[PDB]
Ligand binder design. Structure first.
Ligand SMILES: Nc1ncnc2c1ncn2[C@@H]1O[C@H](COP(=O)(O)OP(=O)(O)OP(=O)(O)O)[C@@H](O)[C@H]1O
Ligand SMILES: [Mg+2]
Lengths: 73, 375, 73
């Protein structure tokens, strides 16, 4: 996530993230490449990355139940 | 009868046909050999002239030379600051050249295959008028403001929640106006060299100054327009240097004429207090979330082209979709089409819309709902 | 902005070269395809179906999309 500060900050990674945001959707539409992303902690992620036009479908992986565990073993 | 020469005549005709290609080949060889007997010339900039036959010129790199000039060349065009070409073995003035145009600025000058018009954007018919009041009317009918006794503003910025239709509006304005236009992203003009970052922006303002009617648009201004740190780290004060260079270029010691700027960002908290001052960014434009009528308009815009069937009721869709965006409604249309894809159908029913609305609705639980306002 | 080969002394264009890419970017393209199949994953049928209909399908069955007037995710 981005933030506001005046004593010190962390801006370079934010600029690379802004360029990545601009690559998806943005001024120039792209329709030949597909993007897959993986993570395991969503609450610390920037809301602009979770826009519907930038990341369309969201899949959640639940913990396996009894039958799934038996199948895995 | 008289065909005693006919065979020899045909042989001569074939030989002439071959000689045509042999002469094309001879010409090609002549051009190839003629081209390879020339050398290049170094490029520099003149500073002043000491006497009738002596000038002092500076190359693109450091060293400065005291050089002569060609006899036939005119000496009335060599004012200080012009660009000249010098011989590589004697360093004599040979020719003067026009001003440079950077390849980056050339690429930035024209890149827009899109053809979006005003019919594809809906729900914000007032902010579009507010924006067009700045860049369209003063550039064509400028005696009205002089008659009243004011000066029209220069720039403006647009802000709001993500995905409310800012870049789309900018694309529509750029694609539906006959004037010189520049399009750039603020995060693509930075590089590790010492002076390039502040040089590129000076170059683009010079290019805009040359062709007097231009519009400059810079997306994601928060990349370089953030607040200036105290006790900050190295390799970060260069961005600040570029920032104050930009602040001086616009509303500085020299006035701009017939130049307008447009900026966009979806969180204006972090912007420098000096950049938001009136006189630099005169107008602040807000693009909020759509209303019920705006939602119905966007739905009618985007749900049109699909091969629908049966009866459709937009009222329930409008009531259910709360706090959505244009991207959310496009996603609703896409998800309805996907549910149509399953069960092997080739038409859409309102039940698909009802399912897709609630499918999209719960995905917004994990997305923050904060809203930011400039201050 | 084109990339050209120039004579070392006379300084004339001799040929045109293909556009160059960073070594790090080139090194991240896959060469040896993995050998894992769908059969060895248990208890993720819904996730697999939802993922395959948004990535693989819009490539081999595009004719099913424009016939309806819907853009892929
Ligand atoms: N009023 C509108 N009418 C139609 N479509 C809209 C409207 N507002 C937004 N959209 C949709 O938004 C999509 C992309 O939005 P856009 O690129 O303008 O985002 P934004 O508001 O600039 O957000 P950000 O740049 O912060 O990601 C377009 O493809 C379009 O379908
Ligand atoms: Mg945008």
């Amino acid at each position: 996530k981005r933030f506001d500060s005046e004593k010190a900050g962390d801006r370079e990674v934010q600029r690379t993230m802004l360029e990545l945001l601009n690559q998806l959707d943005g001024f120039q539409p792209n329709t030949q490449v597909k993007v897959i992303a993986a993570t395991n902690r969503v609450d610390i992620l920037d809301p602009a990355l979770l826009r519907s036009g930038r990341l369309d479908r969201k899949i959640e992986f639940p913990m396996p139940n009894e039958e799934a565990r038996a199948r895995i073993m | 009868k008289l065909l005693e020469h006919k065979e020899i005549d045909g042989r001569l005709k074939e030989l002439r046909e071959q000689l045509k290609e042999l002469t094309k080949q001879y010409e090609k060889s002549e051009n190839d050999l003629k081209a390879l007997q020339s050398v290049g010339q170094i490029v520099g900039e003149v500073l002043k002239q000491l006497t009738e036959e002596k000038f002092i010129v500076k190359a693109t790199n450091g060293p400065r030379y005291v050089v002569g000039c060609r006899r036939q060349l005119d000496k009335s065009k060599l004012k200080p600051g012009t660009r000249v070409a010098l011989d590589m073995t004697t360093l004599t003035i040979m020719r003067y050249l026009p001003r440079e145009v950077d390849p980056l600025v050339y690429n930035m000058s024209h890149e827009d295959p899109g053809n979006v018009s005003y019919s594809e954007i809906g729900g914000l018919s007032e902010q579009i008028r507010e924006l067009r009041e700045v860049i369209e009317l003063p550039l064509t009918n400028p005696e009205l403001f002089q008659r009243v006794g004011i000066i029209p503003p220069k720039g403006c910025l647009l802000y709001g929640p993500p995905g409310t239709g800012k870049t789309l509006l900018a694309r529509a304005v750029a694609s539906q106006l006959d004037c010189n236009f520049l399009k750039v992203v603020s995060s693509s003009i930075v590089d590790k060299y010492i002076g390039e970052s502040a040089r590129l922006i000076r170059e683009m303002f010079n290019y805009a100054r040359d062709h007097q009617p231009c519009i400059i648009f810079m997306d994601e201004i928060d990349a370089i327009g953030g607040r200036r740190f105290s006790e900050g780290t190295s390799a970060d004060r260069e961005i600040q240097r570029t920032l104050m260079e930009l602040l001086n270029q616009m509303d500085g010691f020299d006035t701009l004429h017939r130049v307008k700027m447009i900026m966009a960002t979806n969180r204006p908290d972090t912007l420098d207090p000096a950049l938001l001052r009136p006189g630099r960014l005169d107008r602040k434009i807000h693009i909020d979330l759509p209303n019920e009528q705006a939602r119905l308009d966007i739905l009618k815009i985007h749900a049109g082209p699909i091969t629908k069937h049966g009866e459709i009721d937009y009222e329930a869709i409008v009531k259910l979709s709360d706090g959505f965006n244009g991207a959310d409604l496009r996603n609703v249309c896409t998800e309805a089409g996907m549910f149509a894809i399953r069960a092997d159908h080739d038409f859409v029913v309102q039940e698909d819309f009802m399912k897709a609305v609630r499918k999209v609705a719960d995905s917004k639980k994990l997305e923050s709902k904060l809203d930011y306002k400039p201050v | 902005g084109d990339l050209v080969g120039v004579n070392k002394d006379s300084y004339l264009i001799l040929e045109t070269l293909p556009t160059e890419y960073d070594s790090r970017v080139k090194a991240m393209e896959v060469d040896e395809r993995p050998t894992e199949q769908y059969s060895d994953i248990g208890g993720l049928d819904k996730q697999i179906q939802e993922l395959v209909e948004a990535i693989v399908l819009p490539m081999n069955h595009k004719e099913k999309f424009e016939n309806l007037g819907i853009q892929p995710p």
